[PDB]
Structure 1
Amino acid sequence: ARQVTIIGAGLAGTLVARLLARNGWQVNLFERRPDPRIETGARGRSINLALAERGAHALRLAGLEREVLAEAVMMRGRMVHVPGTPPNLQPYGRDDSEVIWSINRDRLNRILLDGAEAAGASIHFNLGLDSVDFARQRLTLSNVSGERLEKRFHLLIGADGCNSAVRQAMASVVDLGEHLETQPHGYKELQITPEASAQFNLEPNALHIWPHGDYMCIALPNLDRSFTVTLFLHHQSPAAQPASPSFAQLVDGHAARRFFQRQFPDLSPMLDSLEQDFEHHPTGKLATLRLTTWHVGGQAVLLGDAAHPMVPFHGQGMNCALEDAVALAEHLQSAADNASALAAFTAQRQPDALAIQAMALENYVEMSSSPTYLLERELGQIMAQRQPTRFIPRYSMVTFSRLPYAQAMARGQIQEQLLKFAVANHSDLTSINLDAVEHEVTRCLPPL
């Protein structure tokens, strides 16, 4: 039986542990945090995420989809809250088969842990990777107190998140060709209780957005009708706009309350614990990190956030990480050797990770910050109606299909240019020749 050591019992690491263990690999998975399945007297994490077709299909292959979906809330569409305008749902797809699912992060992680153990993986908690000696094939782990433990390894999988210790260890034996693109927005998680969401008639089966140009709020529903709200706001005000809102200006919870009362007046009354949440929940950091290299020979490989940190504006990081886990297990299972598997996995996934990193950055303006847009959207709908196997909106290709991200991006670019050019010198749809636009669709977009 082939042996593997996985660092990080998060989403990708646990899924790849199950896929490999059920194929007979001897799997040891190491996690810095305690086992979340061991109930303590501490209050649990209300953190949630959007599960889409890529993630759901990965869970389906693993035999875990039904269990995960049993505690997921359907989000049929985007509910945009602009003061004055009544909120009106913008459906994501054609029917309820084209939806996204809101799931509690910790619940997803517990289901994956049970799944990895049921397949035969051994999971070791309270052990964070500190260093790797590639030449001697040993690694060093430690608990929070720094009590060290050394282990021999044969194949090392870094599924240890955006601040990957495996990636840091690889960077000492190979040039990873890392390019870091910092994101000016920080984030803060806030809560809407079930009583407040019901009192204000906040739709449970939708993804909610409060756009505000350079900043915005989003909310995802929970099974109990509470919502987790995320504020995206610049860490600091730029030199060009010193007065512009930023986390630096929000000195305490009371300052945060005044900011919400002014900028998000229909949201502030639903946020009963705004002051406490603001002061007790730390401000998160966002970034895009691109690597030229994801592996060291046949010895180690990165996947998920360890390989390609991305901004969260498309809700695709976990989806991508689960898609990576499937691809990695498939390559490892069937390759001539580990070195061939890792090189093939990297070559296949790198262009797709670059594509979703670029599309995630682009989705921010779509959510937060039109006259030409409406006519383009209108013409796009007719083209999707006339040619449903050729004209598929980029959001649908990314969210509801398994088309490689790079292909979704390439087809999306053709569509965006086609629409932009077609509407360019026209006031309305009546002056636009629909057959000439459809001609371009049949000429430039092969059927899927």
Structure 2
Amino acid sequence: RQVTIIGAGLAGTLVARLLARNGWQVNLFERRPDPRIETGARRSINLALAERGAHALRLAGLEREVLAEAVMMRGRMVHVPGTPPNLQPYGRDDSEVIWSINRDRLNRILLDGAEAAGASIHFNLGLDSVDFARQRLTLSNVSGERLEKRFHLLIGADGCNSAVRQAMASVVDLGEHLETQPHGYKELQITPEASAQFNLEPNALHIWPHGDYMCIALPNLDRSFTVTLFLHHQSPSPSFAQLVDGHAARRFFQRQFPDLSPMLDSLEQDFEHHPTGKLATLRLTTWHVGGQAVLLGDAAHPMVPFHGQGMNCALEDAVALAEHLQSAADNASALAAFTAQRQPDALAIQAMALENYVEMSSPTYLLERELGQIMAQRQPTRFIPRYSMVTFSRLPYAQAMARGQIQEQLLKFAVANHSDLTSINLDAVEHEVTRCLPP
């Protein structure tokens, strides 16, 4: 059984490994050069690995290797210029944590894993077009030289700007719905010396909320941090358009993030040399063309990054796609079944990711969460906070969102017209928890 995968990123490399070790003949094409071929060139991007992604790597036999290079994040460290930052633990103990991993290093581990299983990877070749009728595709290098290949099954794991998706959209209406996101983002750096000087906790995810914009920082093994600024592209107030150069960015940080600016030694340089990224939510009505082509990961469901679940979801997709392809009656049945299974969950995490921005960038909120804590301690089997369901369990995203709604409305009604917990009867709410939330 033969398969061609476009995109040696995260979902594409994992699915290549899962299929190759199950006896598939896998050819993987990547536009970029092989990152394992060391050059004289300078990437420090990292991201949050959670249970969904970790479990996928576990099935693939790669979790231990990945986690050996990951920094444990036990909770959120929220920074507001006046208050001292105190850790908000993510869960009960160190089993409920998030892992900060270098993106390039994760990709290199996955690349070795795909080749170890027997997949052939071809770099410096980007997909340009697909001829579905003749079952041929065209690739080219950066210099334009074109190369045609026959294909039997085409997997689009080629990112938020998928060329496979573009080619599919010409032979079928994919029912695309693009919801633009006003925030851009910029990557900045904190050195190991600066993070130590300012006593920045290494085993935590750091947030500098500020309403319509915010900063986060994730730790690295060498105690450096990668900082991400999230800020509106244009003003409808601060925006990227008002930050014309690095000196403008410095003044912006000194006023709005005074506690963080002194840690950003290379702010001016990083701001001018690192391009501003774009965010969006893109929903598709269908992800496949017959039994010929299918999308997964960011190619299928671009999402805003405010829940740190895009990679985790993409690796989850890879496991599911490989499972369906392995045991289906035929490729067409597999792709339809894969799409039917994962589409509702992708929509759920896309919606939860958008909702989560409000939860971070920022009364009744505190009393509700207090009661939620008591309910969790009374019925840890039934009342599980949505964040923990998304982050530390493998419950289908849509199921996690549905239970999260039941719980939010539960706490909202119980707290309504109550000044404090002393006036709330905790037994009747537990009764409602047992009534509406199975274990």
Instruction: Name the TM-score, length of structure 2 as normaliser.
Output: 1.00
Within the candidate set 50, 71, 85, 2:83 is matched to 85
1:419 counterpart = 2:411: yes
- Unmatched runs of 5 consecutive residues or more in structure 1: 238-243
User: Quick one: distance in 1 between partners of 2:298 and 2:10?
Assistant: 10
User: Quick one: distance in 1 between partners of 2:332 and 2:203?
Assistant: 46
User: Quick one: distance in 2 between partners of 1:360 and 1:417?
Assistant: 19
What is the deviation of 1:434?
A: 0.3
User: Quick one: distance in 2 between partners of 1:185 and 1:370?
Assistant: 16
Specify the alignment match of 1:128 in structure 2.
126
Q: 1:370 to 1:119 in 2, by over 3 A?
A: closer
* 1:227-266 C-alpha deviation (Å, 9 max, x unpaired): 00000000000xxxxxx10000001000000000000000
* 1:343-395 C-alpha deviation (Å, 9 max, x unpaired): 0000000000000000000000111x480000001000000000000000000
Q: 1:370 to 1:204 in 2, by over 3 A?
A: closer
Return structure 1 stretches of 4+ with deviation > 3 angstroms: none
What is the deviation of 1:12?
A: 0.1
User: Quick one: distance in 2 between partners of 1:94 and 1:129?
Assistant: 46
Counting aligned pairs with the same residue, the percent is 100
Specify the alignment match of 1:303 in structure 2.
296
What is the deviation of 1:176?
A: 0.1
Question: Quick check: 2:135–2:151 contact (8 Å CA) kept in 1?
Answer: yes
SS for the counterpart of 1:230 is strand
User: Quick one: distance in 2 between partners of 1:334 and 1:323?
Assistant: 17
- Unmatched runs of 5 consecutive residues or more in structure 2: none
User: Quick one: distance in 1 between partners of 2:299 and 2:244?
Assistant: 33
Question: Quick check: 2:253–2:261 contact (8 Å CA) kept in 1?
Answer: yes
Specify the alignment match of 1:184 in structure 2.
182
* 1:186-211 C-alpha deviation (Å, 9 max, x unpaired): 00000000000000000000000000
* 1:142-178 C-alpha deviation (Å, 9 max, x unpaired): 0000100000000000000000000000000000000
Question: Quick check: 2:280–2:303 contact (8 Å CA) kept in 1?
Answer: yes
Specify the alignment match of 2:334 in structure 1.
341
Question: Quick check: 2:211–2:362 contact (8 Å CA) kept in 1?
Answer: no
User: Quick one: distance in 1 between partners of 2:379 and 2:324?
Assistant: 35
User: Quick one: distance in 2 between partners of 1:245 and 1:21?
Assistant: 49
User: Quick one: distance in 1 between partners of 2:125 and 2:148?
Assistant: 11
User: Quick one: distance in 2 between partners of 1:146 and 1:4?
Assistant: 25
User: Quick one: distance in 2 between partners of 1:128 and 1:389?
Assistant: 48
SS for the counterpart of 1:171 is helix
* 1:385-439 C-alpha deviation (Å, 9 max, x unpaired): 0000000000000000000000000000000000000001000000001001101
SS for the counterpart of 1:191 is strand
Q: How many residues align?
A: 438
* 1:17-51 C-alpha deviation (Å, 9 max, x unpaired): 000000000000000000000000000x0000000
User: Quick one: distance in 2 between partners of 1:365 and 1:289?
Assistant: 20
User: Quick one: distance in 1 between partners of 2:175 and 2:233?
Assistant: 27
What is the deviation of 1:184?
A: 0.2
Specify the alignment match of 1:402 in structure 2.
394
User: Quick one: distance in 2 between partners of 1:436 and 1:329?
Assistant: 46
* 1:288-326 C-alpha deviation (Å, 9 max, x unpaired): 000001000000000000000000000000000000000
CA RMSD, Structure 1 to Structure 2 (Å): 0.5
User: Quick one: distance in 2 between partners of 1:207 and 1:330?
Assistant: 33
Question: Quick check: 2:53–2:313 contact (8 Å CA) kept in 1?
Answer: yes
SS for the counterpart of 1:355 is helix
* 1:108-135 C-alpha deviation (Å, 9 max, x unpaired): 0000000000000000000000000000
Question: Quick check: 2:209–2:362 contact (8 Å CA) kept in 1?
Answer: no
